[PDB]
Design a binder for this molecule. Structure first.
Ligand code: NI
Length: 341
């Protein structure tokens, strides 16, 4: 059955709760973003109203084949009424079309659901600042002090300079970027832009990108792999064997590969700076691991919560074991005692 952390008290709403069949009492199902864990269970067979951003609706329509009659896209940063209740969608700074939802309950309680998010100080000058928020449903993916990472911009700068140097030294090098869902598109778009190239990719991946309301998209991407010097492949193929194999498929048009694996955190965040990063190499193939995160670091999460001063926090990630919940509760109490709320 649908957990309490996916229910919004004193409405018939749920959030990211598509895997439990019909939820008793639910009149509107919200979807924060198009990642499979959050959409799990949605298909052409779903017949209840879904509320989401415009980008998330394009994906539902075109990739999942959800029938149009059940898709209710809402604009961002706009007060809207849904089944008699005031709501606002805000940019979550996660993947394309990802939202946080602000719910103004009839009794005067205010609830923020973050969805998946990467907390940023620009969120401190949104509609959130206009009133008190009583309850917070929080993306706790990286809620532990070891989880540090560079800014998105530091990582992109490094990627840009690395790629530019490699292709200027060898104009027959190919650049490959690994991918498994939406998100982290700036990695491959910024590399292509510095090399004067479109990004080449499979038909399924191109169809995904065509849904994302990216300006001038037709000038940036193509299905003609031949004509392009940056290619996208599934993350699982980003290894020496997969990459040599791909290089044989391209028709001797390239004689070297430089590949990037955008990952989350892995244990080597605790020493290395981005400027120290060096690749793994075997022969004419090099692979760089780059920690481009679309989740809050510990420090970004803590700052956001200490600013917001919620009366209660409800975790949405790592809630499956008592040890994790206990550890998280400890950090929330520290934050509260330091900041005086
Ligand atoms: Ni996500």
């Amino acid at each position: 059955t649908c957990p309490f952390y996916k229910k919004i008290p004193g409405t018939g709403f749920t959030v990211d709760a598509f895997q439990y069949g019909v939820v008793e009492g639910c009149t509107a199902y919200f979807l924060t973003h198009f990642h499979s864990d959050h959409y799990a269970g949605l298909s052409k067979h779903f017949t209840f109203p879904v509320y989401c951003s415009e980008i998330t609706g394009n994906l539902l329509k075109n990739k999942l084949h959800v029938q149009e009659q059940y898709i209710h896209p809402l604009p961002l940063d706009t007060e809207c009424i849904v089944n008699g209740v005031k709501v606002v969608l805000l940019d979550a700074n996660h993947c394309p079309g990802a939202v946080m939802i602000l719910f103004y309950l009839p009794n005067g309680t205010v609830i923020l659901h973050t969805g998946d998010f990467r907390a940023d100080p620009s969120m401190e000058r949104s509609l959130l600042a206009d009133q008190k928020v009583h309850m917070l449903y929080l993306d706790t993916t990286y809620c532990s002090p070891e989880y540090t990472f560079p800014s998105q911009q530091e990582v992109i700068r490094f990627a840009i300079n690395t790629a530019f140097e490699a292709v200027t030294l060898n104009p027959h090098a190919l650049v490959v970027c690994g991918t498994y869902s939406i998100g982290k598109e700036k990695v491959f778009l910024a590399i292509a832009d510095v090399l004067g190239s479109k990004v080449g990719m499979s038909q399924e991946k191109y169809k995904t990108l065509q849904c994302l309301n990216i300006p001038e998209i037709n000038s940036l991407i193509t299905t003609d792999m031949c004509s392009s010097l940056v290619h996208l492949l599934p993350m699982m193929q980003i290894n020496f064997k997969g990459l040599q194999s791909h290089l044989k498929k391209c028709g001797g048009k390239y004689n070297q590969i430089l590949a990037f694996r955008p990952t989350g955190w892995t244990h080597s965040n605790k020493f290395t700076r981005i400027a120290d990063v060096i690749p793994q190499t075997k022969g004419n193939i090099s692979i760089y691991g780059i920690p481009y995160s679309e989740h809050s670091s510990y420090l970004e999460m803590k700052r956001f919560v200490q600013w917001l001063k919620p009366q209660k926090i409800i975790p949405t990630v790592n809630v499956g074991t008592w040890k994790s919940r206990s550890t998280m509760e400890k950090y929330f109490r520290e934050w509260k005692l330091e900041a005086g709320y």
